[PDB]
């Protein structure tokens, strides 16, 4: 066994080794291993991406106009975000400016995704870490109604409703066919909700499973379908016609009316179901404001997102702020430049890739994706990993760093960047939320904080949907219908050699696509994705990434039941297909 110090942690691989493979209730394939000491506290944590497909390799030789469609299939959970980053990157390389309505509709596509994705994560992915579904069978339906009505105006609160939900669950489990609830962690001492809160949360799980399908109708109107809507380089293909012959063939007033109806219902669901449920998880699980801090009080990163001034990606345009904090210095939010070769770099000394020198980090315009499955001694065989070798290569995820620092990205990172940049709405929202929980601001830098910030962001995005919709309608009232720029559609109009960066804030954090075009085709396409940051393996200095740091120092009540590990990993909303691409 060995021990070393990094980022204030003592990384110690003595003691019992626990393996969690597969991690479930995530997107895609992840393995996690830890070591625990004699007090059942984690002293080592190992984050492993257990899949790879190679989109950066497949994209070579493609037409830049086609790239969005390929890279959209990096992930069907954060569907659309990679298409957006792609059309941004190709437009940046060629020098294309899109019309305002295209930019507004892209912002609607991204805000729709934030709403949908955050809602399904809260309920279907993370929810069962916090709600003991089986304990809901012991609830009093009248006390459940009272609880629900104390927390929310939401209509669906009758005692009969909660009894009908409870009875449906009772009938579902009575035959032993427990389905997704089979062999769960039910009854673990870290389940702290009372039975009435479990039945309220379970009812809302089912309501969210139903309602989430409606949110993406906005993607179907502008993008044809969800999952995986369509896009174009130069804007969007959803031509608008309000008052001319043939409006039946275009985005017309009836199509826009459908979008407005979904926006209203989406805000109402998020504000009256998910927001009160997130605050209730906080009220009943306050100790989790002190667990899973990880890098969230050290190093956090946002690129920023939602340019409100079309084709302006600067600070005055982005509605979601960008910036970096390192060394715990929140008084100095630093600017990020995605072209600077000293800023974003990826290491592979602990990943299944080859570089000519694995001791140095490569900026993505110098990126290399040469897969090399080389696990070393894993106490089994190359086809039987019993214990990853975290002293050598242990993941399909590359290790991104920012100026050599290991960073956390995602909702909590973004909230801390906007708060410390002095965004008024954020400061007021965060302070009121932590006040209501009777917790200090530092309580947000935690596993509970990641969940609270994600829910807050769903609310923010539902508000921005209306703002963007109103901006689109203002343009239409002023006779501004344009949705595409085609001056540079034809390859004969492009630079013979050019390169560009497309960046945004995906639901899970900072996303960048770096593209080099030569002779009308993709010469290089490198992606660094939010879960690549968070789920990162170690670097040549031994620095740990956000997952490994957040798991360090965590108490486990029952080592064989990884509920604490799941709670913290799920709080980051892992997407492993995103991380590996």
């Amino acid at each position: 066994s060995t021990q070393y110090e990094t980022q204030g942690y003592t990384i110690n691989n003595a003691g019992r080794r626990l393996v969690v493979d597969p991690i479930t209730r995530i997107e895609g394939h992840m393995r996690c291993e830890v070591n625990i000491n004699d007090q059942n506290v984690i002293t080592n944590a190992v984050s492993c991406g257990t899949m790879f497909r190679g989109l950066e390799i497949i994209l070579q030789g493609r037409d830049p106009r086609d790239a969005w469609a390929f890279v959209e299939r990096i992930c069907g959970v954060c569907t659309g975000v990679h298409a957006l980053a792609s059309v941004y990157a190709i437009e940046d390389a060629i020098g294309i400016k899109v019309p305002d309505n295209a930019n507004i509709i892209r912002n609607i596509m991204l805000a729709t995704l934030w709403c949908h994705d955050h809602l399904v994560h809260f309920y279907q992915l993370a929810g069962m870490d916090w709600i003991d579904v089986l304990d809901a069978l012991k609830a009093d339906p009248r006390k459940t109604s009272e609880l629900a009505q104390s927390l929310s105006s939401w209509p669906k609160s009758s005692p009969g409703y909660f009894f009908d939900v409870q009875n449906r669950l009772k009938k579902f489990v009575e035959g032993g066919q427990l389905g997704i609830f089979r062999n769960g962690y039910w009854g673990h001492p870290q389940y702290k909700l009372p039975p009435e809160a479990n039945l309220m949360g379970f009812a809302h799980y089912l309501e969210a499973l139903d309602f989430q399908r409606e949110i993406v109708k906005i993607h179907a109107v502008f993008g044809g379908k969800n999952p995986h809507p369509n896009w174009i380089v130069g804007g969007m293909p959803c031509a608008i016609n309000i008052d001319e012959s043939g409006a039946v063939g275009a985005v017309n007033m009836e199509r826009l009316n459908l979008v407005q109806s979904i926006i209203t219902r989406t805000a109402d669901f998020i504000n009256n179901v998910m927001i009160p449920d997130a605050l209730a998880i906080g009220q009943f699980n306050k100790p989790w404001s002190e667990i899973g801090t990880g890098l969230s009080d050290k190093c956090v990163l946002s690129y920023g997102a939602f340019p409100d001034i079309a084709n302006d990606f600067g600070e005055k345009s982005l509605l979601m702020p960008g910036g970096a904090v390192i060394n715990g210095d929140f008084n100095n939010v630093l600017p990020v430049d995605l072209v600077d070769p000293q800023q974003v770099q990826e290491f592979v000394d602990h990943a299944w890739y080859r570089y000519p020198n694995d001791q140095v980090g490569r900026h993505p315009f110098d990126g290399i994706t040469d897969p090399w499955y080389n696990p070393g001694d894993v106490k089994g065989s190359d086809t039987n990993i019993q214990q990853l070798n975290e002293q050598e290569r242990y993941s399909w995820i590359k290790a991104p760093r920012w100026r050599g620092n290991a960073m956390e990205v995602g909702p909590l990172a973004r909230t801390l960047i906007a708060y410390h940049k002095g965004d008024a709405a954020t400061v007021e929202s965060v302070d009121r939320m932590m006040s209501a929980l009777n917790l200090p601001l530092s309580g947000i830098q935690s596993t509970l904080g990641r969940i609270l910030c994600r829910a807050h962001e769903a609310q923010w995005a539902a508000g921005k949907l209306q703002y963007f919709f109103d901006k689109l309608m203002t343009n239409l009232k002023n006779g501004n219908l344009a949705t595409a720029s085609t001056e540079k559609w034809e390859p004969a109009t492009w630079p013979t050699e050019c390169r560009g960066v497309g960046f945004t804030e995906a639901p899970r954090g900072a996303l960048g696509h770096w593209a080099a075009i030569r002779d009308g085709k993709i010469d290089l396409y490198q992606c660094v994705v939010p879960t690549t940051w968070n789920a990162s393996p170690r670097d040549p200095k031994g620095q740990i990434g956000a997952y490994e740091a957040a798991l360090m120092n965590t108490k486990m009540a029952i080592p064989e039941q990884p509920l604490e590990i799941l709670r913290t990993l799920h709080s980051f909303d892992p997407c492993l297909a995103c991380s590996t691409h």
């Binding site: 479930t24 299939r73 089979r182 109107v221 063939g249 799941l566």
Partner: protein
Amino acid sequence: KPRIPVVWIHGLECTCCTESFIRSAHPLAKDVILSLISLDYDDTLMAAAGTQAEEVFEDIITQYNGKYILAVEGNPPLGEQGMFCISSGRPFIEKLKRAAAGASAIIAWGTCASWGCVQAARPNPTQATPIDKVITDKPIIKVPGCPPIPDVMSAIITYMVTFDRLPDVDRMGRPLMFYGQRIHDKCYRRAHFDAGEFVQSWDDDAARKGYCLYKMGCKGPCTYNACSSTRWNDGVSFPIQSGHGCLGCAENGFWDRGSFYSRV
């Protein structure tokens, strides 16, 4: 009244087929899971993780040997001894073969499980391989599309539960009900195609009247799916109705049939 056991596994994928499934409008995915099937294993949705999830997998395929349906999302990579997709420390293909051996039938969800989809596009770095090239002794229903239509997925499930039989299939294993006809043979813009009325560049006057997308690269003429009739997201739209040509996403090898913007 017991529900039919279903095991849903995931190879190399983007999870768009699980996401499509939960979009179902009728029946709601909630009602499929609570009333129509027993979804007994599914890494995206299940409570258990790690050793607890391994116990569920082993218990269900043993108890229900010969009697469960296997749903497969994604595909197995043959490169690096299968360790481009690792599950419980071992190649995913081992889990695929164990789950297939006990299944009464297999549903290959999406272009990934049916044909290969994006990871199999040139130069296929992982040697991603569709299910029917690995599993050769079981009924496999291909439900292609990237992803398939939500209400097509749930209609195929309800068919099988209600009628207690597999759907009838074409020579490629696709259900005739939804894959028997081409997008272009049920496209509401066919009048414009017949008339020579085409979009020539994005957002031109033709685009604003809903003219045909053939000259913008629409692959509807060579693609079998239900998009132009059943449509997407509770009948709200489909690719062509929102102004983009069909990419061809239900067909084998569609990524490598040239630029999406080159005409058929």
